[PDB]
Design a protein around this ligand. Structure first.
Ligand SMILES: [Ca+2]
Ligand SMILES: [Ca+2]
Ligand SMILES: [Ca+2]
Length: 513
């Protein structure tokens, strides 16, 4: 019993099968067989005895097998549950991209009205809000500055009842957390409503608090393009109106001059200067993407564009970033405080490249001459259809949706494709009843993705409810090129982006041309 139970409760057939196929008759996996697994099934490209041997040295529990360069089923499972068995590429979980191109070539993690913790009309404001966003890797923050008592400028949502905080307090928080998550540059969007005196106080604080982190002069040689994330490493740069406005502030604006959208052009004309940044509401951006997709795209090659949520989103709800990234828009600001598929996709995108907050755009979106238009797809380097097969095998220890300690989840899995319009899809598995510990679906979906370079694959788990709305149990979003193949475990995150230590999905992912 105690053994026959212990094992059964802790037993995974799909794992057994997988080890069997890989190992066959043998009770162990020899390095040669592991390597075959790594290549045949996991499609590792660095697949070779070196990889295999590191896997064993890293994950093999048995001293005998370890020393004798073999992998036991136990070590097989350990590997599969590790960062190396993660569906989200371990290699991409460290900065690995070209960090030397101009800012306009990267998608940049950006926050909207960063100071807010809740809604846009009466909820609270707090430095905490800035701390959290920064800890989530956010690079672009927003400060809405108004005159406050005692000549101390405050921050809050103009014309609302949102609670207030101090501009100075905000600056210290930023100073303290700016680089905790990434070494790359932080951009502070100043929406100045301050009188002239308080503006001067602002400038004083900036200088005093930020000190040398503050970038108050052009980089030497930075002349025809924005500098690179590398060039601005460890800096904080200001975005705002540049000469109503005191010079103290105005002169601190270097590469991010707030500007009204002129139009897209081509030459050293209207389509703003590289050091000029235009903003667009969700609505306006969509329209422009709808009508001048390629113009916008091309514009974004050398220019930074900021998008922000529509005014009706007083609940701090978010729009989908993907639709904007597809246009090359880099500073796509979202309400970082609001849980949802939108932020899920957002942080999934930015977990890439070591979560540094700057993700290099695909080449075709860095080509000032592309004829790309996600909206009107034609032949080009971006067209590269892939057949993605995803098998949702089983789930392990799905978190209790917090809904009575005597109820058991009735989980189902939704798999979605996010990317250019034609590629978007969603599929769902059946519901397993009263099983969150080890539900088994063994269901497979297949998707055709034409522009993988702009896609993300999202796994969502829900607690099915007949009588009501299904509770969100966990989720994981993986950018196409970070999606690992073979047998892998998807590590589920909560609504707030937190890691769920033991909540996983075991899947098999195949990508083919
Ligand atoms: Ca704002
Ligand atoms: Ca139930
Ligand atoms: Ca239910």
């Amino acid at each position: 019993e105690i053994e026959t139970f212990y094992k059964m409760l802790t037993q995974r057939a799909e794992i057994d099968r997988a080890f069997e196929e890989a190992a066959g008759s043998a009770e162990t996996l020899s390095v040669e067989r592991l390597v075959t697994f790594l290549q045949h099934q996991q499609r590792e490209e660095e697949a070779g005895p070196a990889l295999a041997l590191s896997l064993i040295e890293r994950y093999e529990p048995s001293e005998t097998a370890k020393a004798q360069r073999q992998m036991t089923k136990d070590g097989f499972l350990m590997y599969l549950l590790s960062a190396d068995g993660n569906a989200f590429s371990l290699a991409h979980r460290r900065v690995y991209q070209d960090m030397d191109q101009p800012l306009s070539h990267y998608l940049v993690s950006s926050s909207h009205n960063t100071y807010l913790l809740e809604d846009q009309l009466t909820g609270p404001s707090s430095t905490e809000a800035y701390i959290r966003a920064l800890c989530k890797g956010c690079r672009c923050l927003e400060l809405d500055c108004w005159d406050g008592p005692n000549q101390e400028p405050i921050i809050y949502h103009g014309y609302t009842f949102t609670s207030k905080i101090l501009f100075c307090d905000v600056l210290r928080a930023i100073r303290d957390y700016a680089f905790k998550a990434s070494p790359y540059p932080v951009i502070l969007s100043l929406e100045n409503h301050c009188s002239l005196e308080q503006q001067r106080v602002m400038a004083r604080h900036l200088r005093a608090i930020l000190g040398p982190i503050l970038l108050d002069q052009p980089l030497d040689g930075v002349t025809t393009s924005l500098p690179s994330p590398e060039q601005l490493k460890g800096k904080i740069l200001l975005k705002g109106k540049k000469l109503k406005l005191v010079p103290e502030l105005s002169d601190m604006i270097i590469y991010c001059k707030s500007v009204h959208f002129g139009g897209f052009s081509s030459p050293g004309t209207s389509g703003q200067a590289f050091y000029e940044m235009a903003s667009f509401s969700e609505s306006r951006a969509l329209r422009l993407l709808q009508e001048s997709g390629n113009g916008f795209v091309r514009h974004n090659v050398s220019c930074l564009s900021r998008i922000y949520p529509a005014g009706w989103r007083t609940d701090s709800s978010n729009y989908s970033p993907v639709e904007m990234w597809n246009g090359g828009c880099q500073i796509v600001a979202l309400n970082f405080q609001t849980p949802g598929p939108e932020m899920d996709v957002y942080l999934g995108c930015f977990q890439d490249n070591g979560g540094c907050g700057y993700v290099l755009k695909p080449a075709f979106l860095r080509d000032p001459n592309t004829t790309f238009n996600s909206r009107a797809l034609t032949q080009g380097p971006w067209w590269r259809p892939e057949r993605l097969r995803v098998r949702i095998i089983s789930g392990q220890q799905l978190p209790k949706v917090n809904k009575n300690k005597n109820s058991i989840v009735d989980p189902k899995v939704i798999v979605e494709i996010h990317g250019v319009g034609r590629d978007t899809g969603s599929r769902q598995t059946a519901v397993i009843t009263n099983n969150g510990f080890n539900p088994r679906w063994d269901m497979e979906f297949e998707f055709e993705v034409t522009v993988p370079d702009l896609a993300l694959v999202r796994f969502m788990v829900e607690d099915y409810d007949s009588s009501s709305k299904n509770d969100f149990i966990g989720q994981s979003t993986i950018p196409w090129n970070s999606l690992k193949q073979g047998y892998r475990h998807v590590h589920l995150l909560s609504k707030n982006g937190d890691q769920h230590p033991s909540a996983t999905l075991f899947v098999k992912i195949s990508i083919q041309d």
